[PDB]
mmCIF file of all heavy atoms in Angstrom:
data_model
loop_
_atom_site.group_PDB
_atom_site.id
_atom_site.type_symbol
_atom_site.label_atom_id
_atom_site.label_comp_id
_atom_site.label_asym_id
_atom_site.label_seq_id
_atom_site.Cartn_x
_atom_site.Cartn_y
_atom_site.Cartn_z
ATOM 1 N N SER A 1 -2.912 -12.845 -3.868
ATOM 2 C CA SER A 1 -2.311 -12.859 -5.189
ATOM 3 C C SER A 1 -1.353 -11.637 -5.296
ATOM 4 O O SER A 1 -1.439 -10.645 -4.577
ATOM 5 C CB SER A 1 -3.366 -12.755 -6.256
ATOM 6 O OG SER A 1 -4.027 -11.518 -6.265
ATOM 7 N N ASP A 2 -0.430 -11.778 -6.288
ATOM 8 C CA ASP A 2 0.450 -10.637 -6.578
ATOM 9 C C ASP A 2 -0.323 -9.430 -6.990
ATOM 10 O O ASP A 2 -0.013 -8.313 -6.607
ATOM 11 C CB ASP A 2 1.407 -11.034 -7.728
ATOM 12 C CG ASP A 2 2.608 -11.815 -7.248
ATOM 13 O OD1 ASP A 2 2.839 -11.908 -6.006
ATOM 14 O OD2 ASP A 2 3.376 -12.336 -8.124
ATOM 15 N N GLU A 3 -1.386 -9.629 -7.806
ATOM 16 C CA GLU A 3 -2.230 -8.545 -8.291
ATOM 17 C C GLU A 3 -2.981 -7.855 -7.120
ATOM 18 O O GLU A 3 -2.978 -6.623 -7.033
ATOM 19 C CB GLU A 3 -3.207 -9.105 -9.268
ATOM 20 C CG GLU A 3 -4.089 -8.110 -9.964
ATOM 21 C CD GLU A 3 -5.075 -8.765 -10.863
ATOM 22 O OE1 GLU A 3 -4.747 -9.111 -12.039
ATOM 23 O OE2 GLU A 3 -6.202 -8.969 -10.427
ATOM 24 N N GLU A 4 -3.582 -8.622 -6.242
ATOM 25 C CA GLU A 4 -4.301 -8.060 -5.112
ATOM 26 C C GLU A 4 -3.340 -7.330 -4.134
ATOM 27 O O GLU A 4 -3.637 -6.285 -3.618
ATOM 28 C CB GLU A 4 -5.109 -9.100 -4.367
ATOM 29 C CG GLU A 4 -5.821 -8.675 -3.053
ATOM 30 C CD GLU A 4 -6.970 -7.685 -3.321
ATOM 31 O OE1 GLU A 4 -7.507 -7.612 -4.437
ATOM 32 O OE2 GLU A 4 -7.373 -6.959 -2.380
ATOM 33 N N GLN A 5 -2.149 -7.936 -3.945
ATOM 34 C CA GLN A 5 -1.150 -7.283 -3.107
ATOM 35 C C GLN A 5 -0.700 -5.900 -3.704
ATOM 36 O O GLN A 5 -0.484 -4.969 -2.973
ATOM 37 C CB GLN A 5 0.094 -8.176 -2.931
ATOM 38 C CG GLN A 5 1.160 -7.589 -2.020
ATOM 39 C CD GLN A 5 2.513 -8.254 -2.207
ATOM 40 O OE1 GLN A 5 2.951 -8.554 -3.293
ATOM 41 N NE2 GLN A 5 3.176 -8.546 -1.072
ATOM 42 N N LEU A 6 -0.533 -5.871 -5.052
ATOM 43 C CA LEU A 6 -0.175 -4.611 -5.704
ATOM 44 C C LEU A 6 -1.253 -3.569 -5.493
ATOM 45 O O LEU A 6 -0.969 -2.396 -5.199
ATOM 46 C CB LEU A 6 0.128 -4.823 -7.193
ATOM 47 C CG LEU A 6 0.568 -3.561 -7.989
ATOM 48 C CD1 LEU A 6 1.912 -3.096 -7.486
ATOM 49 C CD2 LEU A 6 0.601 -3.816 -9.540
ATOM 50 N N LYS A 7 -2.511 -3.971 -5.657
ATOM 51 C CA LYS A 7 -3.643 -3.060 -5.357
ATOM 52 C C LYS A 7 -3.534 -2.539 -3.924
ATOM 53 O O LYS A 7 -3.696 -1.312 -3.719
ATOM 54 C CB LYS A 7 -4.938 -3.798 -5.593
ATOM 55 C CG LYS A 7 -6.167 -2.977 -5.259
ATOM 56 C CD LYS A 7 -7.423 -3.825 -5.534
ATOM 57 C CE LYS A 7 -8.698 -3.056 -5.144
ATOM 58 N NZ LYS A 7 -9.827 -3.979 -4.829
ATOM 59 N N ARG A 8 -3.216 -3.369 -2.972
ATOM 60 C CA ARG A 8 -3.157 -2.919 -1.593
ATOM 61 C C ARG A 8 -1.967 -2.024 -1.366
ATOM 62 O O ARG A 8 -2.069 -1.079 -0.587
ATOM 63 C CB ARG A 8 -3.182 -4.122 -0.654
ATOM 64 C CG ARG A 8 -4.452 -4.909 -0.743
ATOM 65 C CD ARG A 8 -4.457 -6.179 0.104
ATOM 66 N NE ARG A 8 -5.655 -6.969 -0.099
ATOM 67 C CZ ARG A 8 -5.988 -8.059 0.537
ATOM 68 N NH1 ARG A 8 -5.208 -8.602 1.443
ATOM 69 N NH2 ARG A 8 -7.133 -8.675 0.227
ATOM 70 N N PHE A 9 -0.824 -2.298 -1.985
ATOM 71 C CA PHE A 9 0.352 -1.439 -1.894
ATOM 72 C C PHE A 9 0.027 -0.028 -2.382
ATOM 73 O O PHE A 9 0.405 0.971 -1.774
ATOM 74 C CB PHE A 9 1.536 -2.007 -2.712
ATOM 75 C CG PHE A 9 2.428 -2.966 -1.970
ATOM 76 C CD1 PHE A 9 1.912 -3.870 -1.034
ATOM 77 C CD2 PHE A 9 3.788 -3.028 -2.225
ATOM 78 C CE1 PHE A 9 2.709 -4.737 -0.370
ATOM 79 C CE2 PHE A 9 4.605 -3.875 -1.546
ATOM 80 C CZ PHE A 9 4.077 -4.796 -0.632
ATOM 81 N N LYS A 10 -0.750 0.064 -3.495
ATOM 82 C CA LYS A 10 -1.054 1.358 -4.049
ATOM 83 C C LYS A 10 -2.063 2.114 -3.149
ATOM 84 O O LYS A 10 -1.927 3.328 -2.952
ATOM 85 C CB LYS A 10 -1.577 1.187 -5.453
ATOM 86 C CG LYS A 10 -0.529 0.694 -6.433
ATOM 87 C CD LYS A 10 -1.022 0.565 -7.866
ATOM 88 C CE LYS A 10 0.160 0.380 -8.822
ATOM 89 N NZ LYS A 10 -0.310 0.004 -10.203
ATOM 90 N N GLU A 11 -3.015 1.375 -2.582
ATOM 91 C CA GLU A 11 -3.909 1.981 -1.580
ATOM 92 C C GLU A 11 -3.100 2.549 -0.394
ATOM 93 O O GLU A 11 -3.299 3.726 -0.009
ATOM 94 C CB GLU A 11 -4.913 0.948 -1.089
ATOM 95 C CG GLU A 11 -5.910 0.545 -2.135
ATOM 96 C CD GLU A 11 -6.703 -0.718 -1.710
ATOM 97 O OE1 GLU A 11 -6.531 -1.197 -0.561
ATOM 98 O OE2 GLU A 11 -7.491 -1.193 -2.582
ATOM 99 N N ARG A 12 -2.166 1.769 0.141
ATOM 100 C CA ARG A 12 -1.341 2.222 1.251
ATOM 101 C C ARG A 12 -0.530 3.473 0.860
ATOM 102 O O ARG A 12 -0.417 4.408 1.619
ATOM 103 C CB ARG A 12 -0.409 1.125 1.697
ATOM 104 C CG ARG A 12 -1.109 0.007 2.393
ATOM 105 C CD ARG A 12 -0.099 -1.024 2.920
ATOM 106 N NE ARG A 12 -0.786 -2.097 3.639
ATOM 107 C CZ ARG A 12 -0.211 -3.102 4.253
ATOM 108 N NH1 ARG A 12 1.110 -3.239 4.225
ATOM 109 N NH2 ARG A 12 -0.946 -3.979 4.871
ATOM 110 N N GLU A 13 0.009 3.435 -0.351
ATOM 111 C CA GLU A 13 0.788 4.578 -0.865
ATOM 112 C C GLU A 13 -0.069 5.841 -0.893
ATOM 113 O O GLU A 13 0.474 6.950 -0.812
ATOM 114 C CB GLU A 13 1.315 4.253 -2.235
ATOM 115 C CG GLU A 13 2.293 5.229 -2.791
ATOM 116 C CD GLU A 13 2.742 4.845 -4.187
ATOM 117 O OE1 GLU A 13 1.888 4.380 -4.962
ATOM 118 O OE2 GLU A 13 3.948 5.053 -4.533
ATOM 119 N N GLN A 14 -1.394 5.699 -1.032
ATOM 120 C CA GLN A 14 -2.269 6.888 -0.996
ATOM 121 C C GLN A 14 -2.928 7.139 0.334
ATOM 122 O O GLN A 14 -3.749 8.081 0.402
ATOM 123 C CB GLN A 14 -3.364 6.754 -2.058
ATOM 124 C CG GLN A 14 -2.796 6.594 -3.468
ATOM 125 C CD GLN A 14 -1.870 7.744 -3.881
ATOM 126 O OE1 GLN A 14 -2.148 8.921 -3.619
ATOM 127 N NE2 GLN A 14 -0.722 7.416 -4.535
ATOM 128 N N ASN A 15 -2.585 6.381 1.381
ATOM 129 C CA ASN A 15 -3.253 6.490 2.680
ATOM 130 C C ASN A 15 -2.452 7.262 3.664
ATOM 131 O O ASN A 15 -1.326 6.899 4.000
ATOM 132 C CB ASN A 15 -3.552 5.082 3.215
ATOM 133 C CG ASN A 15 -4.407 5.062 4.470
ATOM 134 O OD1 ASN A 15 -4.269 5.948 5.336
ATOM 135 N ND2 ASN A 15 -5.284 4.078 4.598
ATOM 136 N N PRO A 16 -2.999 8.367 4.221
ATOM 137 C CA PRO A 16 -2.227 9.216 5.179
ATOM 138 C C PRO A 16 -1.691 8.464 6.397
ATOM 139 O O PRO A 16 -0.649 8.872 6.936
ATOM 140 C CB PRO A 16 -3.208 10.296 5.560
ATOM 141 C CG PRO A 16 -4.187 10.352 4.476
ATOM 142 C CD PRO A 16 -4.304 8.942 3.944
ATOM 143 N N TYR A 17 -2.375 7.419 6.843
ATOM 144 C CA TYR A 17 -1.935 6.697 8.023
ATOM 145 C C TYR A 17 -0.950 5.606 7.734
ATOM 146 O O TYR A 17 -0.423 4.983 8.628
ATOM 147 C CB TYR A 17 -3.159 6.073 8.758
ATOM 148 C CG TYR A 17 -4.227 7.049 9.128
ATOM 149 C CD1 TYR A 17 -5.429 7.189 8.421
ATOM 150 C CD2 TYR A 17 -4.058 7.931 10.236
ATOM 151 C CE1 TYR A 17 -6.431 8.048 8.782
ATOM 152 C CE2 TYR A 17 -5.016 8.853 10.620
ATOM 153 C CZ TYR A 17 -6.211 8.894 9.886
ATOM 154 O OH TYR A 17 -7.180 9.787 10.262
ATOM 155 N N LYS A 18 -0.665 5.339 6.440
ATOM 156 C CA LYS A 18 0.085 4.127 6.024
ATOM 157 C C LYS A 18 1.247 4.406 5.047
ATOM 158 O O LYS A 18 2.134 3.598 4.963
ATOM 159 C CB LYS A 18 -0.856 3.094 5.421
ATOM 160 C CG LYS A 18 -1.935 2.563 6.349
ATOM 161 C CD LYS A 18 -3.014 1.843 5.528
ATOM 162 C CE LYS A 18 -4.146 1.331 6.391
ATOM 163 N NZ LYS A 18 -5.120 0.581 5.523
ATOM 164 N N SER A 19 1.177 5.523 4.280
ATOM 165 C CA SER A 19 2.192 5.746 3.245
ATOM 166 C C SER A 19 3.573 5.891 3.826
ATOM 167 O O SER A 19 4.567 5.483 3.190
ATOM 168 C CB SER A 19 1.827 6.972 2.414
ATOM 169 O OG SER A 19 2.110 8.175 3.048
ATOM 170 N N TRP A 20 3.700 6.489 5.027
ATOM 171 C CA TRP A 20 5.006 6.717 5.667
ATOM 172 C C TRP A 20 5.770 5.403 5.828
ATOM 173 O O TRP A 20 6.986 5.364 5.919
ATOM 174 C CB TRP A 20 4.794 7.375 7.026
ATOM 175 C CG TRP A 20 4.080 6.461 7.962
ATOM 176 C CD1 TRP A 20 2.725 6.275 8.039
ATOM 177 C CD2 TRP A 20 4.662 5.556 8.931
ATOM 178 N NE1 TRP A 20 2.415 5.373 9.032
ATOM 179 C CE2 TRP A 20 3.597 4.907 9.593
ATOM 180 C CE3 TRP A 20 5.984 5.301 9.334
ATOM 181 C CZ2 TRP A 20 3.793 3.975 10.579
ATOM 182 C CZ3 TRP A 20 6.175 4.370 10.325
ATOM 183 C CH2 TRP A 20 5.099 3.705 10.934
ATOM 184 N N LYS A 21 5.075 4.267 5.941
ATOM 185 C CA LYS A 21 5.671 2.987 6.301
ATOM 186 C C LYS A 21 6.015 2.115 5.093
ATOM 187 O O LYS A 21 6.687 1.095 5.246
ATOM 188 C CB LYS A 21 4.699 2.211 7.222
ATOM 189 C CG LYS A 21 5.323 1.008 7.945
ATOM 190 C CD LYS A 21 4.243 0.253 8.732
ATOM 191 C CE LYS A 21 4.751 -1.150 9.154
ATOM 192 N NZ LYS A 21 3.821 -1.879 10.047
ATOM 193 N N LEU A 22 5.590 2.504 3.868
ATOM 194 C CA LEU A 22 5.821 1.717 2.676
ATOM 195 C C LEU A 22 7.059 2.316 2.014
ATOM 196 O O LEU A 22 7.031 3.443 1.523
ATOM 197 C CB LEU A 22 4.613 1.783 1.770
ATOM 198 C CG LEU A 22 4.675 1.005 0.459
ATOM 199 C CD1 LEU A 22 4.852 -0.470 0.665
ATOM 200 C CD2 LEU A 22 3.422 1.297 -0.361
ATOM 201 N N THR A 23 8.134 1.538 1.943
ATOM 202 C CA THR A 23 9.443 1.979 1.492
ATOM 203 C C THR A 23 9.782 1.385 0.121
ATOM 204 O O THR A 23 9.091 0.480 -0.378
ATOM 205 C CB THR A 23 10.546 1.603 2.475
ATOM 206 O OG1 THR A 23 10.648 0.171 2.532
ATOM 207 C CG2 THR A 23 10.168 2.114 3.879
ATOM 208 N N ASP A 24 10.830 1.906 -0.490
ATOM 209 C CA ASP A 24 11.324 1.318 -1.745
ATOM 210 C C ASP A 24 11.732 -0.155 -1.576
ATOM 211 O O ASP A 24 11.526 -0.929 -2.501
ATOM 212 C CB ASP A 24 12.488 2.156 -2.288
ATOM 213 C CG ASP A 24 12.038 3.557 -2.755
ATOM 214 O OD1 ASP A 24 10.814 3.849 -2.638
ATOM 215 O OD2 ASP A 24 12.883 4.310 -3.223
#
């Protein structure tokens, strides 16, 4: 879902191993 994907995007944004890869 859009909602679950947004939750996962925000998790990645806070994750040291993954935030570098999430762009605008």
Side-chain angles (χ1 to χ4, degrees):
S1 69
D2 278 350
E3 186 184 276
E4 174 70 20
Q5 182 198 44
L6 182 66
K7 178 181 178 204
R8 296 176 184 183
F9 272 36
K10 292 181 167 171
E11 292 167 5
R12 290 184 178 183
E13 190 183 36
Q14 301 304 318
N15 185 323
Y17 304 106
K18 299 163 182 183
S19 78
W20 66 277
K21 193 186 165 174
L22 179 62
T23 66
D24 292 0

